[PDB]
Amino acid sequence: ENFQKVEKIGEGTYGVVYKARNKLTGEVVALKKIRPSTAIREISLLKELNHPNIVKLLDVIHTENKLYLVFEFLHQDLKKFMDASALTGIPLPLIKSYLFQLLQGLAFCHSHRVLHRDLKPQNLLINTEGAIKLADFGLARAFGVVTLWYRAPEILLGCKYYSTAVDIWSLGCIFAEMVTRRALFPGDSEIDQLFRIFRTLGTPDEVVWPGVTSMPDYKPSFPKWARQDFSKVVPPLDEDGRSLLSQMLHYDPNKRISAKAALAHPFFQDVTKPVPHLRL
Ligand SMILES: O=S(=O)(F)c1ccc(Nc2nc(OCC3CCCCC3)c3[nH]cnc3n2)cc1
Predict the structure, then answer these.
(1) C-beta of residue 7 within 8 angstroms of C-beta of residue 28
(2) Is 118 marked active-site?
(3) Ordered structural domains, the chain, with CATH
(4) Residue 279: exposure state from Cβ atoms within 10 A (0-12, 13-18, ≥19)
(5) What are residue 29's DSSP bridge partners?
(6) Which residue out of 118, 188, 217, 270 is catalytically annotated?
(7) Closest CA to 120 of 109, 144, 136, 139
(8) How far apart are the CA of 57 and the centre of ligand 1, in A?
(9) Which residues contact 136 (CB under 8 A, 6 or more apart)?
């Protein structure tokens, strides 16, 4: 009715996403068609979760067994930017700026007990002013091939209770990918994802992760790989970077660094806000 579709942006976990224009206000927006009253109330709460590093939810529209979410539109995602920067690499000051901003976003949502649970380059969105913002916070909780590459090990091992730590894991995986220009753990099945994590960080045990062996999908028959050094994992990256990444990829979700504590890490001593060159 009120929205003119301009182009399909892509296909999310819950449905198609279009760039659209509000025929009444002229506002340009992202419109997500979601393909239960519980979900309505949860989504409505998210309208109040407003932060400069969170993509704003402008409105929720249910009509005729159809649910539409109207979001703030940004002009590029991190995946396309990484791909465009592939020959050169994103400069470290911009990597650092983006990480810091995403941690501020996480810190905010986490303080309101809201998780993302499915962070990935395609839902991190950038603009021409050097900002990066998280899209689709809270949607996994609200609504209940999908990429496994950013999935925390506790999820893969069948934990039913997700903590804020699952988002730190995902963002650590993204940090590593910005630095190396390749995905850290590109699994193509749940077991391939778990074994790629184990091949790099070592098969977890009760020493490094108390309780791991009692987890639902833990098998004593898992191969026992030794941990490799982070020097080999994200090589170019300096020791402050490697320190912070190591704390973001701790196996035990209780030991994994919080967003708030990561903002105080020494890696961010010299943080700045560069503007990227974006070709739109
Ligand atoms: O780089 S591209 O030219 F490909 C490009 C990408 C995104 C956008 N803009 C964009 N996209 C969104 O969601 C995409 C969706 C998220 C994950 C699931 C599947 C894809 C948004 N959600 C709220 N605001 C949004 N703005 C503009 C260009």
Answers:
(1) no
(2) yes
(3) 1-75 (3.30.200.20), 76-277 (1.10.510.10)
(4) exposed
(5) 20, 72
(6) 118
(7) 136
(8) 14
(9) 12, 55, 116, 118, 123
